[PDB]
Symmetry: C4
């Protein structure tokens, strides 16, 4: 019983495999891809992430020990704790992403066999078309992030080359940007998994709307029960996704919080002390935009899933109003109403957050408060 997969989870799964976030074999059997746990590639992922974290920590220690005057990035005693936190938070995020990738892939393989059964009753062509449309956004975001990483690395290398520390700065911050790449790939992987589930739930909503209200290929009485079972399976898959990614999700959220606190602090420091390096200002603005984009990538698929659940409730209420009174197609909708009341399809990472648009407002308020706190502490 191989776990066939294709479309979105055929390209980003290979990218994550290359960067160590998806230790899966990729047998080319059939048109789709048969994925399975690849013990031996998990060891490679662990070795890669451990080497990157060790190199990043050693480079951070060397950059702290080289001195405030000599360092080009840490040109202040206060601009050493913030940069150290910046480095360590992405190190922790990449570690959580890789140290836990085998378990996440095991859960993914577990719910593959259920989501394929769900797709068979809806049409795999629609899911394949929707998943192939997310590859363009995947490539665009990955290319933008990689270009920003390369530009930042080159800028700092040329700045350190003036004082004859270009190779030292390259050695110290080589693994930092690889950890950035790993973190971004993990975020995109979660986002596209959630978007695939959202596409499945949208297909479920369309089927519930068009079949339960009289194109049909089935009586609506049996159709409502089939859709109820399908929604239970979809809720199971949503819970598995939320459980697998919960720790990476909370770590990514706190990393975005810390980064939206730190980067504006650096921009303000530059515009108040130097106003000299326009490249630094451009990079700081790009990094603030990138952190906002990361937050959006994390929170938007979950909000869309919640909106699709609300649409499910809307469709079900309309169907119950249009349903014949006291007929067979009135107790089948009662069971679905009880299901909708008992269960909501939402992403709660580790039970702390809710992963919705209201979470963005709270994080932005905390960012503003901690930013003004740092500004007061600097002065």
């Amino acid at each position: 019983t191989p776990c066939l997969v294709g479309g979105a989870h055929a390209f980003i799964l290979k990218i994550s495999s290359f960067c160590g976030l998806a230790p899966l074999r990729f047998e080319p059997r059939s048109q789709e891809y048969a994925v399975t746990i690849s013990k031996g590639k998990c060891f490679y992922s662990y070795i890669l992430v451990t080497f990157l974290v060790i190199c990043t920590i050693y480079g951070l220690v060397a950059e702290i020990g080289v001195g405030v005057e000599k360092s080009v990035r840490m040109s202040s005693r206060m601009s050493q704790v913030v940069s150290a936190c910046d480095i360590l938070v992405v190190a922790v995020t990449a570690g959580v992403g890789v140290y836990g990738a085998p378990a996440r892939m095991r859960t993914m393989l577990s719910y593959m066999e259920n989501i394929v059964a769900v797709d068979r009753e809806l049409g795999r062509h629609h899911s394949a078309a929707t998943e192939r449309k997310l590859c363009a956004l995947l490539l665009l975001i990955l290319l933008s992030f990689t270009i920003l990483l390369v530009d930042d690395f080159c800028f700092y290398a040329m700045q350190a080359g003036k004082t004859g520390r270009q190779w030292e700065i390259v050695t110290n911050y080589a693994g930092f940007y690889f950890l950035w790449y790993i973190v971004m790939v993990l975020e995109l992987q979660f986002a596209f998994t959630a978007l695939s589930l959202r596409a499945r739930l949208k297909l479920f909503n369309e089927a519930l709307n068009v079949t339960a209200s009289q194109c049909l290929q089935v009586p609506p009485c049996e159709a409502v029960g089939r859709l109820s079972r399908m929604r239970c399976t979809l809720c199971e898959v949503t819970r598995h996704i939320a459980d697998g990614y919960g720790l990476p999700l909370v770590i990514i959220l706190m990393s975005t919080l810390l980064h939206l606190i730190v980067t504006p602090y650096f921009l303000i420091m530059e515009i108040i002390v130097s106003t000299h390096r326009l490249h630094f200002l451009v990079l700081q603005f790009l990094w603030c935009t990138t952190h906002l984009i990361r937050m959006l990538v994390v929170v938007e698929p979950c909000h869309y899933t919640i909106r699709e659940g609300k649409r499910t409730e809307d469709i079900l209420c309309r169907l119950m109003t249009l349903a014949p009174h006291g007929g067979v197609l009135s107790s089948r909708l009662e069971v679905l109403s009880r299901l909708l009341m008992l269960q909501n399809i939402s992403y709660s990472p580790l039970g702390m957050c809710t992963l919705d648009r209201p979470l963005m407002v709270t994080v932005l308020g905390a960012v503003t408060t901690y930013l003004v706190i740092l500004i007061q502490f600097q002065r």
Copy 2:
């Protein structure tokens, strides 16, 4: 199938059309008004808002570049970021109001054909009388805001005339007050749309109260089902209104937050440094009152709609208690109870906020915190 409309959406729709927030043709067919998308007036609205935003940005740049000593409004380096934010937030609010007006009018025309069907089963005379009562408040609020705008503009013009910059200040801040007018008209338009829907839902509540409990013109068994379908249509219209105005609503909320942070800062600065211009103090107090009134205009209709939904729940519970046990008028109320449990009628702009009275407390607390933060930063 023309979208007939009249009463509230016959006067403020013409005002919004004049200011570019409602690109609709206004054929005088029948007693009411037949509205439709008016491609060619949407182009006029886009040109108008683009010209206003360009003029406002150019005037802001000129006022920043004229110097702290020369400028009469920006008489401080710190009183340049706050004034720039003040200008740009209303520029963004007006842009969002106009760049998106055709789509909002399309959604409005979409739910017109449903809300007229809802009104036909309740009585168009009541809705026309209720909508005509909102025109007096519309005229009062618009006149008050326009008088305040004219007074502020004249005050600043006379202040700049002392240093020979009256025409310069007029050129720099001509479009700023037009953007204020557009923002206020957009707020009033949303408020009166929400109030019209609240009036419809109040009529629905009265019908549910008087018909399901034995003036009738219909058996209560069929009446409960008809009212359930009506409530589903009303929920659909509420969702369309919330989706159309969601981005303008969140932009208006953040603009009110920023303005309630900024205006008391200016008032405190004046009372601590000058205590000379009584006109400035009067204007600052009037502007604080106006921002509070704007917040109330935004949040009160949604709170009233939520209160009407709670009244619907109350009436339904009373009806279920009074209903005969095991009769036909017991499962019809079960469907309505399930509908009420699954669906609540509330305005959630873009999914972030909830647009209720509790939102006022949070915004006021944030206003106080950021205001004391600015006061600390000034000293």
Copy 3:
């Protein structure tokens, strides 16, 4: 159809009538008291509150104008805004309590005729005994508050007598303590109304527990329907109480917030600048305790009502589990379950707050934040 009343609303209603918070006639007909609107006593209440507010404002103006050095209470420029806010917040609270007393008494008379019908099906002796037990707490709290008011007034009078301003200070702060008395009486009136409704709902819970589970005087099938109607009436009375007292409740909550922000500020100022007047420290500690007691008086009855509602849910779940399957006493409990799901018995003043124990934590956190803000501003 006179509105007979006795017990709790026979003593505190006379106290509130004396202080202008209950303009009701008190015909001694029957053992209980027949209350009705007393137009002519409402005029007396309005005149009394207007005179008190005018005297308080004039005294505040005179105390501000007498000078920082001459004033014994306002011995600082910063300790003039806080004291002015302290005075004006209780002035506003007393005004809201009295300007609105006739409408609150009208709503009270409206729900008297329903709550007496509720009591007749439960036993008026229990309600009379429970309401008579609240009179001891009423007298204790009123006596404690009056003693504190008299002690504070005497302390300030003797302090001003040293500089020959005892009669001036008496004239300036005569009405301030009368406004305190009015505010405290209003708080106690709301608290005891809510406690009476809580006692009624507790009787309802006991009846539901002992009658629906087989002392009975009625079959349980009809008993469940009677209790459902009773709970609907109790929810109506709760909503009327919340609507009548909502504005006084929110004003009292913000007054307690401001006072818990102000009084510790005065205590800290004294312990850092003088450490001389032990009477002042004792009074400040007593006032902090009094503000906490006021907060508890406001929030505890609502929390107890919510707890009684949760107990209702618990009892109903136990009854449904113990009920025969498919019998007549299974759909009667279904209606009650739907009623409990649709309606919760809670006090939401004007829709902003929730009036529960969690509200205490938020208010205390805001108190701490604003207190440390004032401490930072002083230094």
Copy 4:
């Protein structure tokens, strides 16, 4: 009708009895332990806690009065209010734990007779095995905390021995660490009671999953009703546990808040003024970790219970989808669905908090805000 108990509540109940948190007799009848109220041991617990609190307060007073220069712990005027709060908060926590232990043991004995009936229908061997697995964690945490207490006490004793105040410091802080031991034992007692109830509810979930979906020993129709009654009893036990421990829970939560505010302040003070005592830094880091562990011990069992309730909802939805339409095993699941909708199994201490993972985020944010407030106040 003795209350037989064993496993977890056979070892920690003896530990709590020794430290005064469980005044119960421990007759060795049968394999398990028969516990009952032990009037005479409650007097011993009261005497012990009163003596400890009096000694702690006297030692705190002596340490404040010995002088800033002489004291080794309070080497600052500002580092006297924070240390006094540190001491008094654990004194209050231990007092609440012991002053209230007889009532908590009475409630525990009350719900013992219900939870044993619940266990009999599930299998006492599973509960005994699960409860015996918590003893290893109990011993580990108690040993770690005792080792930390002894190390801290010895460190401070040797530090005071340099200035010839080792016996004085021992006398002053002897009871402080005993109060710490009592607080930790109370936290572990609550945690293991909650974990035992979680194990019972997990057994209930497994039985509902395997029996209602066709190993059985009973038809599923009667099984669903039996499980509904069992869940009602489990909710009753959860409510009794939450009511008994509510005040200790809120006191422990505020103590953890205050300690996570205070300990990082001491660590920062040391790293900014001395950087000399590495033992002090190690102890401060260990104490921060211990306070975080205490918070986790408090909040994790409740979160696991809520997760088990969500799993109950999931299982019930799956069963309703798989249940035959219109059969007997469709209305039995309707009653259970109504039970799940009306009741959630959660720990709300005194009604203020919710005791979940989201509570950790709020407390951590408050910790950060108050910590930076103290840092600003120090400078």
